[PDB]
Amino acid sequence: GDPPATVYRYDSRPPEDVFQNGFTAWGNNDNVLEHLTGRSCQVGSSNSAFVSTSSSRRYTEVYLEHRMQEAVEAERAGRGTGHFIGYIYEVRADNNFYGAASSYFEYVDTYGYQSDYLAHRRIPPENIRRVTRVYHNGITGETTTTEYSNARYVSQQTRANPNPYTS
Numbered sequence: 001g002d003p004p005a006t007v008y009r010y011d012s013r014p015p016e017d018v019f020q021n022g023f024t025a026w027g028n029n030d031n032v033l034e035h036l037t038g039r040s041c042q043v044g045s046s047n048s049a050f051v052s053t054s055s056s057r058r059y060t061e062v063y064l065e066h067r068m069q070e071a072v073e074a075e076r077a078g079r080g081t082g083h084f085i086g087y088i089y090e091v092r093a094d095n096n097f098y099g100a101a102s103s104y105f106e107y108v109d110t111y112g113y114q115s116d117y118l119a120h121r122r123i124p125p126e127n128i129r130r131v132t133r134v135y136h137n138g139i140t141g142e143t144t145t146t147e148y149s150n151a152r153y154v155s156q157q158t159r160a161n162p163n164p165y166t167s
C-alpha cells in the first residue's frame, strides 16, 4: 500500500516543451479545494500551485479520449475541424507530490480523488520519463499513437509523499 512511484498527466503541450522544461504550476494559490474543483486551474483563475496527476493511467486516457471526442463533436456541429493531438506523460512521483484525497480530507476537516496526486509548484523535467502522443485525423477519422522517451529523465528511488499537503 505504498504511495505510487509512477503517476500520469494528460496535457495538450508537446515533449519539445515538457521534456526539457518540465511542468510549472499556474501560480501560487495552494488552496486544495479550489484546485480539486478546478476553480484555480485553466478554466478558472489560472493560478493553482499544483500540477495535476493521477496514479491511474486509465484516468488520463479517459480525459484524453473525452477531449478527442469533443473535437469530433465540434466537427459534426461545424464548429471545428476534428483534428486533435493529446499527450499522456508518465512521471516519477516524489515527496513534492501529495495525495488529493488525503489533502482534501485534511483541508475540509480543518477549514470546512483517490488516485489523484497534486504536484506542488513544479514537475521537473528529470521526473518526466516518457510520453504517449495520440493524433486523431479529423478528415479521415484515423487515430495514431506514438511513444517517446525523455533523455533527461533521471531514474531514482522516489515515491509520492505519504502525508496530506499542508500550507
Ligand SMILES: NC(=O)c1ccc[n+]([C@@H]2O[C@H](COP(=O)([O-])OP(=O)(O)OC[C@H]3O[C@@H](n4cnc5c(N)ncnc54)[C@H](O)[C@@H]3O)[C@@H](O)[C@H]2O)c1
Binding pocket: 008, 009, 010, 011, 012, 013, 024, 025, 026, 035, 036, 037, 038, 041, 042, 043, 051, 052, 053, 054, 060, 063, 116, 117
Ligand atoms: N491533467 C491530468 O491528467 C489530471 C490528473 C488528475 C486530476 N486532474 C484533475 O483535473 C482538473 C485539472 O485538470 P488539468 O490538469 O487538465 O488542469 P490544468 O489547468 O493544469 O491544465 C489544463 C491545460 O492548461 C494548459 N496549461 C496548464 N498549465 C499551464 C501553464 N503553467 N502554462 C501554460 N499553460 C498551461 C495546458 O493546455 C493544459 O492541458 C483538476 O480538478 C484535477 O484534480 C487532472
